């Protein structure tokens, strides 16, 4: 019973085992985390980083001894936080959503300090993890060798593993209600507070007569990168909206405006990022995935989409 069935050393103490510099807590959505990042309570950062503190006070004089330092480290005192930026400012935390039947259930990030007792989770990787917010949990692991931190940024980082290993659509992707915001910005209406109408300026939602469903039209000169690196310039009349036009701020303009001239539900939005990955390069495709997140949150609410007794015709 140290070997033959489930409980044996092979499965309970070797191929998986209990591990230091680790923890777990309930998942929470973190919409201000940039794609390379994760949020962690100050006293959880203290706990996970004790070897950096009971390990650097004695290396700067910032306490008289490791014994006396009990009064200062458990206190979360000021001298803890130079000692922790010296980590955080370039340190890849690892994160985990067991049972890890697939690669994307484990990834790597970067600390952000917060309140509370939870684990705060960037919305585009919440899809890649299948995060299920019923008070289920995720787990945390600190890498401490220079090598593990080097390979975590190079091999496990969210920005650096974006796609489905089975085919190559993104699963680190514009997620659950983000894509209703993008669909809303790219739907159009009759009467529409603007049945045909245009403007720039978010402040003109406070001028009296605007809508993200108002039906803009504009000639936009538009470009398409070749495999050799040159730019196939183009130009076209369009039949579009204010939200479709705002998306020309966010779109990597080495692919043409005419790709936005549709309705960007989950049925369609992944293929814009996929086309960017096929043609432009990695950084351009990451920025185009990341910046679409906050673009969704600025406008998903303003859609007013609901379920209610006369949404049931």
């Amino acid at each position: 019973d140290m070997i033959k069935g489930k409980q044996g050393r092979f499965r309970q103490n070797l191929l998986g085992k209990r591990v230091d510099y680790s923890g777990r807590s309930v998942i929470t959505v973190g919409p201000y985390l940039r794609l390379h990042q994760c949020g962690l309570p100050k006293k959880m950062a203290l706990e996970l980083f004790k070897p950096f503190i009971y390990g650097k006070l004695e290396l700067r004089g910032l306490a008289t001894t490791i014994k006396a330092a009990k009064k200062m480290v458990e206190r979360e005192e000021a001298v803890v936080w130079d000692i922790l930026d010296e980590v955080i400012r370039e340190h890849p935390v690892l994160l985990n959503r067991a049972p890890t039947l697939h690669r994307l259930g484990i990834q790597a990030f970067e600390p952000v300090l917060i309140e509370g007792k939870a684990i705060q989770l960037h919305p585009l990787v919440c899809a890649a993890y299948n995060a299920d917010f019923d008070g289920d949990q995720m787990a945390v692991h600190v890498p401490l060798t220079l090598e593990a931190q080097l390979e975590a940024r190079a091999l496990m980082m969210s920005t650096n593993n974006i796609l489905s290993p089975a085919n190559g659509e993104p699963i680190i992707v514009p997620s659950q209600d983000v894509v209703l915001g993008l669909y809303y910005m790219t739907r159009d209406c009759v009467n529409a507070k603007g049945m045909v109408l245009t403007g720039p300026a978010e402040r003109l939602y406070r001028s009296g007569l605007a809508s993200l469903h108002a039906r803009v039209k504009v000639r936009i000169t538009e470009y398409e990168k070749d495999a050799n690196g040159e730019l196939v310039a183009k130009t076209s009349l369009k039949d579009t909206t204010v939200g479709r036009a705002i998306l020309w701020m966010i779109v990597p303009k080495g692919l043409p405006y005419s790709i936005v001239n549709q309705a960007l539900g989950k049925k369609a939005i992944s293929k814009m990022l996929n086309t960017c990955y096929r043609i432009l390069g990695l950084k351009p495709t990451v920025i185009f995935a990341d910046q679409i997140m906050y673009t969704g949150f600025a406008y998903a609410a303003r859609s007013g989409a609901s379920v209610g007794i006369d949404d049931m015709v």
């Binding site: 209600d177 989409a305 379920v307 209610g308 007794i309």
Partner: protein
């Protein structure tokens, strides 16, 4: 968000999820609760001036 009463809303919960949950009693408790609590809020105002 805030209501046509000119007054904010204590909680917000995603309806885009609801069609996958296949349940609508949650909408009906919310709407009948708007009558049920609205009676008490109107009573808090009415008990002042009495009329």
């Amino acid at each position: 968000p805030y209501d046509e009463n000119g007054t904010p809303v204590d909680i917000v919960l995603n309806p885009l999820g609801v069609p996958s949950r296949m349940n609508i009693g949650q909408i009906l408790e919310t709407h009948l609760g708007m009558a049920a609590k609205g009676i008490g809020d109107k009573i808090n105002a009415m008990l002042k001036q009495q009329q």
